[PDB]
Design a protein around this ligand. Structure first.
Ligand SMILES: Nc1nc2c(ncn2[C@@H]2O[C@H](COP(=O)(O)OP(=O)(O)O)[C@@H](O)[C@H]2O)c(=O)[nH]1
Ligand SMILES: Nc1nc2c(ncn2[C@@H]2O[C@H](COP(=O)(O)OP(=O)(O)O)[C@@H](O)[C@H]2O)c(=O)[nH]1
Ligand SMILES: Nc1nc2c(ncn2[C@@H]2O[C@H](COP(=O)(O)OP(=O)(O)O)[C@@H](O)[C@H]2O)c(=O)[nH]1
Ligand SMILES: Nc1nc2c(ncn2[C@@H]2O[C@H](COP(=O)(O)OP(=O)(O)O)[C@@H](O)[C@H]2O)c(=O)[nH]1
Lengths: 289, 272, 287, 291
């Protein structure tokens, strides 16, 4: 009694996926001094970005800068598209500062739609942002009007992943209270934020990690490009202050590893698929009304 | 004596090899070849007649192997039995022309179709449009002895069921397959006819090449003996068309088909 | 450390197994060539053609059958098309075999239409991902009608020509018939699907792909029933009064190679080619 | 003496905690966790609540109304911390940095300072003047620099200039624990470079050899970086607590807060008062009299 190769179809799919290559697009929104450049330099283990762009006119115009790179880890290549928001929230008047970013996301969606409008369409330049990380200054107080309205405006264009910048600045109780206030605000304002798919699972631990990830939002981010010894003979990436060392790789000090699980390790494919099946589809429908 | 045996089928069915093996010499080479360009130039079934002399049984016989290249070998076979019918009836008209001729000869060569071997493909399905029409118009114009090509393509039970299906198809279409039971025949003759009739359509396997083990085709998983009775009906068909009924075949082609065409043609001439 | 962006292919594997798979296969040949036995032996399901989905005849009939075949958890939704009447007609003109082409074009048309809808709601792919042409084991040459149809279909669907009932032909006969068929195909410009060889892949898997390409036209046999081997071992195949042929034996048939090129190894690649090259050409024509 | 100090900065700097630490009394509540006590009786023997917290200016947790812009709100809380008896009225700004346009905030703060100047002028130019009238002029002002680590923003510069027009303005780096040693050094250097570039008239720590040396050192210290907490250790030491370590506000290296407190309420208090009262106010009065 011989078998059919139905069980080998997924391994074929894996082969084509790994031999083709991937593309990830992340928009890092926030003000100046939220540890964003350092975060993206820490999440990819490489220096994708810089030193700050600085010493220029104080009135910054909100612009969009895309830093593109090709990264190879295990013979798999990823085109990382780190989009920035220079000058956003860094001015005395920040009204209509959300317009450029949502407009850029809509422009990428329209570009993909027009690539589909091609008569003999070929390989696709997909710059639609698969994730949007909005960084909140660790005020420990609440979300600002600029913050909430920008987040709500861009929550329909693509996936939104709230994060509390420089979360090590806040003490444990203060950061937890800040997280609670942020969650209540985004629940009342009805802002839409990406949630890992746990359904309602064969790998009950995977959907359990989904639950753990969704119970850790807004994520606490602690990023450093320098490593220090822990005192036990192991060098951990960390932020070194004389009172104590804030290790980025310890789950007890930060939620950075959860964010890496959501963004690149575990729920990267899900983010890409949601950005391409939910957001882009709505934009295309409205554009073609 | 002069015997005329015709083979009707498509390229592959194994008719040239069957004739080659039933006579023990290379008489007919495949008229279709291995080129799609070797097919007829008239885009209709053509006739290839080759005369050989075989006297190995000390019964000297003048064989005339007829072949129908082009049958079921083009896309449009809507008239792939018309040329065969025309050939048969023209060969009959020659004999009647000599017999209706004044001061004719002693030996008016009999070029008529004494026997026909219509090769039925081993597909297991009912008769196709081409097969049905050709058997319909060739059963009453000449003596037809059904045979199944590449009977290696059907397991024993598959071959039996396909043979029963073809037998029922013959009965349904009212097709007249040789041998024909008559009243002159004796009892032994009637029972022999019943047996060969139950064998029809035959299931013959042919090979002009000999194999060594411990005549047939030897392959990787299989080894057939063309002269094995528990493997093929090649021996039965051989004996039937060479010895058992050869005389009856040549007599019925001169007594039933030819005299029928004679009556028809002469009646038509009388009317006009 | 190791940033885990090389783990995305594994997430794709998991997604694939979670969402199953779907394969639309076409089978064109004469009635009695063995396209109902080959399919069931390929999918090890004797009822592979029991889910029939929704003044004389002068055109082939296109029959659609949808089944589901699941192995080790993964599930595949198979939709097999069978031609009924090919060759049975004494006309066998372009109109005779046109319905098959029209059906393939209709699948592509439905896909294109749903892709070009304002709602653009979830669409199900019915496009024919492969076309198996069954070639009778005459042993002489590729026939006119065979050449005409295979040329008419070599652009619409991936072409997988096979030599049916190959157990009758001797080894040398099979080789010669295979060579003649391949020569006729190349000189009709009929093009067949070439298995892709992934990069950073095993050289043995590359050799398998090359052999799969260079073994065409294949010589496949079909018998889901079990027969006893001369070794006393029950094996899938056919038993005749002279010998026993085994469908799973590579020495006897290219059945395992066809199963590799059609289901086990390059089913997904066949679907990718059909949805990325053939369908886009159909779209350009419709444009 | 009657001393007046302003505390201005973007929301989330640590002004409330800084004031509580300075007073050693939790007299100012943190937003959203308030209403349990706002201007309660002092927990410090020296601190007295001579006037509860009250709003001096206005220009405009409820999750449904979180989007609404607060605007600006200036509040003066009067206390008596003790000849030594000092009548200290602390003015504070809230809603600055919590809206889209912060021009309203700068306008309101400048207008409050100008109105206090005008009140003092009117009292001076009165036929019957109250010799012991209570001046509302802001003798000193501290601007909190948000811990960006890069430099000064636009709102920062404009607000500091507006505050400098009517009172002495001191650049104070807040939440210095957010910066490591090198990071804090670079941030301070950037702040100084930006104020020099835009010519912000920030206060300068610029008769005795020891006095000159102290002024030089204090100038080199600016902007003053500080860690402040309104929470104390079980022993009674104002401290911050983190999972990786516990910070003490008293520690000299962690915070320059005690030098800042000394200059604000000790050494340079009279200097700030005299400069605001006899240089800024006098020039404003001269300009008004020329008008
Ligand atoms: N408290 C804290 N400060 C950080 C962290 N990462 C970086 N910084 C500080 O912020 C600077 C980097 O900011 P940068 O990433 O360039 O800014 P942004 O991209 O505009 O948000 C560093 O020089 C540090 O002074 C962090 O995890 N926590
Ligand atoms: N398996 C099998 N092959 C056969 C049989 N008879 C003939 N063949 C093969 O059929 C091929 C073509 O037969 P041939 O008589 O030359 O051709 P035709 O006159 O055009 O049908 C030859 O290569 C033979 O090997 C048979 O009984 N079984
Ligand atoms: N000689 C031979 N016969 C086969 C082979 N596979 C199937 N058959 C026979 O071919 C016949 C017709 O096959 P079937 O699947 O019913 O044909 P379809 O009408 O084309 O679907 C069946 O009765 C089988 O016994 C094979 O490999 N060799
Ligand atoms: N890391 C750090 N946090 C502080 C410091 N001072 C106060 N905080 C915290 O940061 C927030 C400051 O809010 P508050 O002082 O009311 O600010 P204001 O509204 O700008 O006056 C509170 O959550 C305090 O617990 C400090 O020096 N360092």
């Amino acid at each position: 009694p011989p078998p059919v190769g139905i069980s080998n179809l997924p391994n074929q799919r894996y082969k084509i996926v790994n031999e083709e290559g991937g593309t990830f697009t992340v928009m890092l929104c926030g003000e100046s001094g939220l540890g964003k450049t350092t975060f993206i330099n820490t999440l990819f283990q490489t220096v994708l970005k810089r030193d700050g762009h600085r010493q220029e006119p104080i009135r910054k115009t909100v612009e969009i800068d895309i830093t593109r790179a090709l990264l190879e880890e295990k013979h798999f290549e990823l085109r990382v598209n780190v989009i920035d928001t220079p000058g956003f929230g860094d001015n005395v008047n920040n009204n209509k500062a959300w317009q450029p970013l949502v407009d850029f996301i809509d422009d990428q969606h329209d570009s993909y739609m027009r690539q589909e409008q091609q008569p003999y369409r070929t390989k696709k330049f997909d710059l639609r942002v698969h994730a949007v990380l909005y960084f909140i200054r660790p005020t420990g107080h609440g979300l600002k009007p600029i913050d909430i309205e920008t987040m709500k405006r861009l929550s329909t264009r693509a996936n939104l992943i709230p994060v509390i910048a420089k979360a090590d600045t806040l003490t444990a109780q203060e950061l937890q209270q800040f997280k609670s206030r942020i969650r209540q605000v985004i629940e009342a304002q009805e802002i839409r934020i990406f949630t890992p798919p746990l359904d309602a699972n064969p790998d009950s631990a995977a959907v359990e990690h989904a639950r753990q990830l969704i119970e850790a939002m807004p994520f606490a981010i602690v990023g450093s490009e320098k490593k220090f010894d822990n005192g036990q003979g192991t060098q951990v990436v960390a932020r070194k202050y004389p009172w104590g060392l804030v290790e980025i790789e310890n789950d007890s000090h930060c939620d950075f590893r959860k964010l890496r699980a959501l963004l690149l390790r575990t729920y990267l494919l899900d983010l890409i698929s949601t950005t391409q099946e939910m957001h882009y589809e709505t934009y295309r429908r409205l554009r073609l009304e | 004596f002069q015997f005329n045996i015709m083979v009707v089928g498509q390229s592959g069915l194994g008719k040239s090899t069957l004739i080659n093996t039933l006579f023990a010499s290379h008489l007919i080479d495949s008229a279709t070849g291995d080129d799609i360009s070797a097919l007829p130039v008239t885009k209709t079934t053509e006739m290839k007649i080759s005369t050989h002399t075989l006297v190995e049984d000390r019964v000297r016989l003048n064989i005339n192997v007829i072949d129908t290249p082009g049958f079921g070998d083009f896309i449009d076979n809507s008239k792939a039995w018309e040329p065969i019918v025309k050939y048969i009836k023209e060969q009959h008209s020659q004999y009647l022309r000599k017999e209706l001729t004044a001061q004719r000869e002693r030996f008016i060569t009999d070029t008529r179709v004494h026997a026909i071997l219509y090769f039925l493909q081993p597909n297991g399905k009912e008769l196709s449009r081409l097969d049905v029409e050709a058997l319909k118009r060739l059963t009453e114009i000449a003596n037809v002895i059904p045979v199944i090509g590449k009977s290696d393509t059907l397991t024993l039970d598959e071959r039996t069921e396909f043979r029963e299906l073809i037998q029922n198809e013959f009965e349904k279409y009212n097709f007249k397959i040789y041998p024909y039971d008559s009243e002159e025949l004796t009892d032994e003759e009637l029972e022999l006819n019943r047996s060969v009739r139950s064998i029809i359509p035959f299931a013959v396997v042919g090979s002009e090449n000999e194999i060594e083990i411990n005549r047939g085709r030897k392959t990787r998983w299989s080894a057939i003996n063309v002269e094995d009775i528990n493997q093929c009906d090649f021996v039965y068909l051989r004996e039937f068309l060479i010895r058992t009924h050869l005389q009856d075949l040549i007599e019925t082609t001169s007594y039933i088909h030819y005299e029928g065409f004679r009556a028809r043609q002469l009646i038509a001439l009388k009317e006009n | 450390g190791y940033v885990g962006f090389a783990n995305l292919p594994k997430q794709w594997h998991r997604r694939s197994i979670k969402n199953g798979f779907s394969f639309n296969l076409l089978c064109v040949g004469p009635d009695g060539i063995g396209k109902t036995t080959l399919m069931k032996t390929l999918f090890n399901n004797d009822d592979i053609e029991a889910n029939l989905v929704k003044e004389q005849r002068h055109k082939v009939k296109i029959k659609s059958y949808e089944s589901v075949i699941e192995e080790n958890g993964v599930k595949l939704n198979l939709n097999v098309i069978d031609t009924e009447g090919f060759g049975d007609f004494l006309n066998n003109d372009q109109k005779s075999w046109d319905p098959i082409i029209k059906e393939i074009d209709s699948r592509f048309d439905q896909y294109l239409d749903a892709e070009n809808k304002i709602n653009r709601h979830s669409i199900n792919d019915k496009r024919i991902h492969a076309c198996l042409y069954f070639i009778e084991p005459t042993g002489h040459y590729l026939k006119p009608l065979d050449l005409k149809f295979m040329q008419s279909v070599y652009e619409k669907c991936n072409l997988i020509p096979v030599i049916a009932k190959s157990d009758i032909l001797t080894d040398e006969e099979i080789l010669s018939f295979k060579k003649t068929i391949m020569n006729q195909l190349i000189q009709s410009n009929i093009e067949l699907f070439k298995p892709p060889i992934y990069s950073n892949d095993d050289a043995e898997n590359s050799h398998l792909s090359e052999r799969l390409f260079s073994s065409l036209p294949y010589a496949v046999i079909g018998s889901n029933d079990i027969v006893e081997n001369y070794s006393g071992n029950q094996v899938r195949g056919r038993s005749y009064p002279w010998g026993v042929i085994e469908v799973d034996n590579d020495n006897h048939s290219d059945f395992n190679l066809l199963k590799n090129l059609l289901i086990k190894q390059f089913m997904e690649e066949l679907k990718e080619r059909t949805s990325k090259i053939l369908y886009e050409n159909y779209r350009s024509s419709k444009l | 003496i009657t001393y007046t100090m302003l505390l201005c900065g973007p929301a989330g700097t640590g002004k409330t905690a800084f004031a509580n630490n300075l007073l050693e009394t939790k007299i100012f509540p943190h937003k959203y966790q308030y209403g349990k006590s706002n201007a309660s009786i002092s927990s410090n023997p020296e601190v007295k609540v001579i006037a509860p917290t009250k709003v001096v200016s206005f220009n405009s947790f409820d999750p449904m109304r979180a989007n609404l812009e607060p605007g600006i709100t200036i509040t003066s809380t009067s206390l008596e911390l003790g000849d030594d008896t000092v009548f200290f009225n602390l003015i504070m700004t809230h809603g600055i940095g919590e809206n889209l346009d912060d021009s309203l905030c700068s306008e309101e703060v400048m207008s409050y300072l100008e109105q206090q100047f005008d009140i003092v002028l009117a009292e001076e130019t009165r036929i019957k003047r109250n010799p012991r009238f209570e001046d509302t002029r802001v003798h000193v002002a501290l601007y909190f620099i948000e811990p960006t680590g890069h430099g000064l923003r636009e709102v920062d510069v404009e607000l500091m200039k507006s505050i400098s027009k009517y009172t002495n303005v001191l650049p104070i780096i807040t939440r210095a624990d957010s910066f490591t040693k090198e990071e804090l050094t670079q941030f301070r250097k950037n702040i100084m470079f930006d104020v020099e570039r835009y010519n912000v008239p920030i206060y300068k720590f610029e008769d005795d050899l020891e006095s000159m040396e102290e002024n030089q050192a204090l100038a080199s210290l600016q902007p003053f970086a500080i860690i402040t907490s309104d929470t104390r250790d079980s022993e009674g030491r104002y401290v911050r607590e983190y999972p990786w370590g516990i910070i003490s506000i008293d520690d000299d290296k962690i915070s320059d807060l005690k030098v800042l407190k000394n200059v604000l309420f000790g050494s340079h208090l009279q200097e700030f008062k005299d400069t605001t009262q006899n240089l800024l106010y006098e020039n404003y009065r001269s300009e008004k009299l020329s008008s």
